[PDB]
From a paper:
Protein constructs based on soluble ectodomains of HIV glycoprotein (Env) trimers are the basis of many current HIV vaccine platforms. Two-component, self-assembling nanoparticles are a versatile platform that can present HIV Env and other viral glycoproteins in a well-defined manner.. Here, we describe and comprehensively evaluate a library of de novo designed protein nanoparticles of different geometries for their ability to present trimeric Env antigens. We found three nanoparticle candidates that can stably incorporate model Env trimers on their surfaces while maintaining structure and antigenicity.
The tetrahedral nanoparticles, T33_dn2 and T33_dn10, assembled at a high yield (~80–100%) under all the conditions tested. We used cryo-electron microscopy (cryo-EM) to obtain more detailed information on the structures of the BG505-SOSIP-T33_dn10 and -I53_dn5 nanoparticles and the Env trimers they display. Due to the flexible nature of the linker between the nanoparticle component and the BG505-SOSIP trimer, the initial 3D reconstructions of the complete nanoparticles generated only highly diffuse and poorly defined density for BG505-SOSIP. The data were therefore computationally segmented to reconstruct the nanoparticle core and the displayed trimer as two independent but flexibly linked entities (sub-particles). Nanoparticle reconstruction was performed using a focused refinement procedure in which a solvent mask around the nanoparticle core excluded the signal originating from BG505-SOSIP trimers. Symmetry was applied in all 3D classification and refinement steps: tetrahedral for T33_dn10 and icosahedral for I53_dn5. The final resolutions of the reconstructed maps were 4.25 Å and 12.50 Å for T33_dn10 and I53_dn5, respectively. The T33_dn10 core design model from Rosetta Design was relaxed into the EM map using a combination of Rosetta relaxed refinement and manual refinement in Coot. There are only small, local structural differences between the Rosetta-predicted, unliganded and BG505-SOSIP-bearing models of the T33_dn10 nanoparticle core. The Cα RMSD between the experimentally determined and predicted models is 1.43 Å (on the level of the asymmetric unit), demonstrating that the presence of four displayed BG505-SOSIP trimers did not cause any major structural rearrangements within the nanoparticle core.
Numbering used by the authors:
A (entry chain B): 1 to 277
B (entry chain A), D (entry chain A), E (entry chain A): 1 to 120
C (entry chain B): 1 to 143
Write the structure that this text describes.
């Protein structure tokens, strides 16, 4: 039975993946700004729907090895949808429908992450949890960098605004999703890994935000970027502390503290440089 | 001696211009003639680093640091060479040292955390 | 843990609320009938999605005080989406895309109400039930 | 000697490439080894001129000129260094000398008049 | 000796950067100190070739080749210098030799045929 459900999932995932690729090609084969906008909206819409359909069936996969496959399917669809949108938007530039591209990536990243977390919330193996965490972090990281790069290839305007907020929102949600799944870990080895996953993501989100305000030396964004950076660091740290509190072994408690101090210092330096600009 | 000064200058010029191979050859001369020039040990290590010659970069960075323990950049680059070779424990220690000397080195801090993750 | 889930909800709700406001401003800042139609459709689409995401997480809030917060978040999003649509549609008039405005409000009201009822169906305190009822009635009346 | 030739060449190359600091260091060597190379005295003065080191540029230009009084460019640059320091009387005299050697130096002539105005 | 190594390096750097005149001066030094460096004889010949100094390029290429007969590039450039001077018989012989060493040198082959046509 699990095979039946999983097979329906693989089928839907393959179909969607292919449709996404076809839409992306059409947008590049075509010569108009609208072709790009339509593929971006349709890729995102289809990817969203595919993910939701998968979650709907995936919830019946009592056995973890199938759940793992469902998570992978979601993550793969999300990655392809994001990359397809990125490519079209990046090729297009000219500040036209670029906000849609940023929003679409962020929305897909959120959808996929929460869907993964939702399925992941129903299992018990530690390795599985780690895989779910990894998938979330993977998606968040890719989405952040795709968004970052798009803003650099548009130059200032409002695209960097969208990017700063999108990154902060995504990173925050990803962190909390990780913290939530991570709260079910049984050993320090795994809790520490979750902490690090958070810390790495937080650092990357901060660097992307930092770079966007910094490379445009723009006071509007210096202020927003600073607030976003502080926000990320505070939440990342609190998430870490929640998890850290369940660690009973000093080697890991100390590691977590070092990580927290590192995040805080990184955030502070990014802020200081932006203030000086 | 004048020989050391010329060797140093040629090394430095080639180094700045990206001809690291040339710089290496010149620095070996500068150091053979004057082993205490920490700057040549350092630039030599960088010239090798730039070529992917990480073991050499490590040896020379270590020498530069023995002569000048406060060279935060050398500590940083030392950590980077260890990092590139997969020795995260060492990269971690050296990133921390570079940071103690220079707390503003964001990249060292970021790399410290990344090394910590890779070491596990 | 409930805080984690609730925090994700507050985060999503704030984001959506803000996006709705931005779309509404764009529609008034712009000079075309389509700007209004686009904001109406996007406000409704985003509000719908936000509500659904919230329900999806809110269902894990075993403790009622958090559920109450989730309900409030849904209701607030629904209200802002409705008011934003109303304002744009009312300012616009001229019988253009007005049917969309009506449908959008009704659809949002339905979505929000049923979502609230769905979450509300899982708790036991009488006051909470009354609050859920009040929220539904509030949304229906405004719509 | 070969040492002087290498010093000279390194100085000249660095000079041409804009690394005037390097050129200065190399020329000091070239001159220490061979004090009569007017070209090094001259390029040394220019390397300093380029860095805003006008007092040094003046000293070295004077040496180059003692060795070679017909170096119109050096007279010109000498005048420019004096001009930059506000010593217009000296700039005026040197612009005139550069012009006697090279009447086609329009810039020296223009600068002569400007110096005359600034001196009053 | 260190002097030869510095001379060589300076020559090579100047050569790469296009300052062939400088490279010539440096290579003369490198060879005076160490006459067996075929690479300097070769690069010296090229530095002259680049300036249109074909007779010099021929002399130096010949020396480089006596030290290293397998330098196909030197044979090629030798042939080119003869070609440029109108001595097609010599250019022909050297293009053929460069080709025996390196059959993939299309330009030498094309130039061989062109030289054959010019010689008649």
């Amino acid at each position: 039975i699990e095979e039946v459900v999983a097979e329906m999932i693989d089928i839907l995932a393959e179909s969607s993946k292919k449709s996404i690729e076809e839409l992306a090609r059409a947008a590049d084969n075509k010569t108009t700004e609208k072709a790009v906008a339509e593929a971006i909206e349709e890729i995102a819409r289809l990817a969203t729907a595919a993910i939701q359909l998968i979650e709907a069936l995936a919830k019946n996969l009592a056995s973890e090895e199938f759940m793992a496959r469902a998570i992978s399917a979601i993550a793969e669809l999300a990655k392809k949808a994001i990359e397809a949108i990125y490519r079209l938007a990046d090729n297009h530039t000219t500040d036209t429908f670029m906000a849609r591209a940023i929003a679409a990536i962020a929305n897909l990243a959120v959808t996929a992450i929460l869907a993964i977390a939702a399925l992941a919330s129903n299992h018990t193996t530690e390795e599985f949890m780690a895989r779910a965490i990894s998938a979330i972090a993977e998606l968040a990281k890719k989405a952040i960098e795709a968004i970052y790069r798009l803003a650099d290839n548009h130059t200032t305007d409002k695209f960097m605004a969208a990017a700063i907020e999108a990154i902060a929102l995504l990173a925050t949600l990803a962190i909390l999703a990780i913290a939530l799944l991570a709260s079910n870990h049984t050993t320090e080895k795994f809790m520490a890994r979750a902490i690090m996953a958070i810390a790495i993501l937080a650092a990357k989100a901060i660097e992307a935000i930092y770079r966007l305000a910094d490379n445009h030396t723009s006071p509007t964004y210096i202020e927003k970027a600073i607030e976003a950076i502080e926000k990320i660091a505070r939440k990342a740290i609190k998430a870490i502390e929640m998890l850290a509190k369940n660690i009973t072994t000093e080697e890991y408690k100390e590691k977590a503290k070092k990580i927290i101090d590192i995040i805080r210092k990184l955030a502070k330096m990014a802020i200081k440089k932006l203030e000086d600009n | 001696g004048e020989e050391a000064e010329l060797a140093y200058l040629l090394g430095e010029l080639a180094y700045k211009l990206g001809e690291y191979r040339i710089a290496i050859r010149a620095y070996r001369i500068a150091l053979k003639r004057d082993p205490n020039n920490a700057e040549a040990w350092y630039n030599l290590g960088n010239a090798y680093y730039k070529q992917g010659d990480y073991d050499e970069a490590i040896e020379y960075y270590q020498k530069a640091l023995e002569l000048d323990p406060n060279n935060a950049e050398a500590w940083y680059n030392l950590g980077n060479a260890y990092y590139k070779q997969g020795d995260y424990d060492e990269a971690i220690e050296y990133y921390e040292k570079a940071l103690e000397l220079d707390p503003e080195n964001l990249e060292a801090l970021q790399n410290l955390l990344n090394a910590m993750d890779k070491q596990g």
